[PDB]
Structure 1
Amino acid sequence: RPPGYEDPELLASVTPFTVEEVEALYELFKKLSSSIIDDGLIHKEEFQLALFRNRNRRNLFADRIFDVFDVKRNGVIEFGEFVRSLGVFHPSAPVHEKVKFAFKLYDLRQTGFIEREELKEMVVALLHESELVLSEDMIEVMVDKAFVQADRKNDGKIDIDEWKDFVSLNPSLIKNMTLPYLKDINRT
Structure 2
Amino acid sequence: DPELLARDTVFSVSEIEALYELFKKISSAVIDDGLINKEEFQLALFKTNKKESLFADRVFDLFDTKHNGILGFEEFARALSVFHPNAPIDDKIHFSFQLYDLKQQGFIERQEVKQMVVATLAESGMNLKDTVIEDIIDKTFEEADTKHDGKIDKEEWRSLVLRHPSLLKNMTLQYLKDITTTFPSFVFH
TM-score range, shorter chain: 0.7 to 0.9
Confirm or deny that 1:74 pairs with 2:66: yes
What is the aligned partner in structure 2 of residue 100 from structure 1?
94
Query: 1:131-165: per-residue Cα shift (whole Å, max 9, x none)?
Result: 33444433322210112322233222222112112
2:39 maps to which of 22, 45, 48 = 48
- Residues 114, 12 of structure 1: CA spacing in aligned structure 2 closer, same or farther, 3 A cutoff? same
Q: Corresponding residue for 1:159?
A: 153
Shift of 1:29: 2.7
Q: Distance in 1 between matches of 2:8 and 2:123?
A: 31
Q: Which has the higher contact order (CA 8 A, sep 6+)?
A: 2
> Residue type matched to 1:56 in 2?
F
CA distance in 2, matches of 1:78, 1:49: 12
Q: Where does 1:35-184 land on structure 2 (aligned, <5 Å)?
A: 36=31, 38=33, 42=36, 46-51=37-42, 53=43, 56-57=46-47, 58-70=52-64, 73-75=65-67, 76-184=70-178
Superposed displacement of residue 173, structure 1: 0.9
Task: Tell me how large the CA RMSD over aligned residues is.
Answer: 2.6
TM-score, structure 1 length as denominator? 0.77
Give the residue type in structure 2 aligned to 1:25: L
Q: Which amino acid aligns with 1:165?
A: S
Scaled by the length of structure 2, what TM-score is found? 0.77
Contact 1:68–1:101 (CA under 8 A) maintained in structure 2:
no
The change in CA–CA distance for 1:144 and 1:103 in structure 2 (over 3 A counts) is: same
Distance 1:17 1:128 in 2: 28
Is the Cα–Cα contact under 8 Å of residues 22 and 83 in structure 1 kept in the other structure? yes
Structure 1's unaligned 5+ residue stretches are 1-6
1:183 Cα offset (Å): 0.8
Kindly, what percent of the aligned residue pairs are identical? Answer: 56
* Structure 2 CA distance for aligned equivalents of residues 146 and 19 of structure 1: 40
Q: Deviations over 1:97-144 (max 9, x none)?
A: 100111111124444321111211221232233133444433322210
**Partner SS, residue 148 of structure 2:** coil
Residues 118/169 of structure 1: CA separation in 2 closer, same or farther (3 Å cut): same
What are structure 2's unaligned runs of at least 5 residues? none
Distance, in Å, in 1 between the alignment partners of 2:155 and 2:148 is 13
One-letter code of the match for 1:123? V
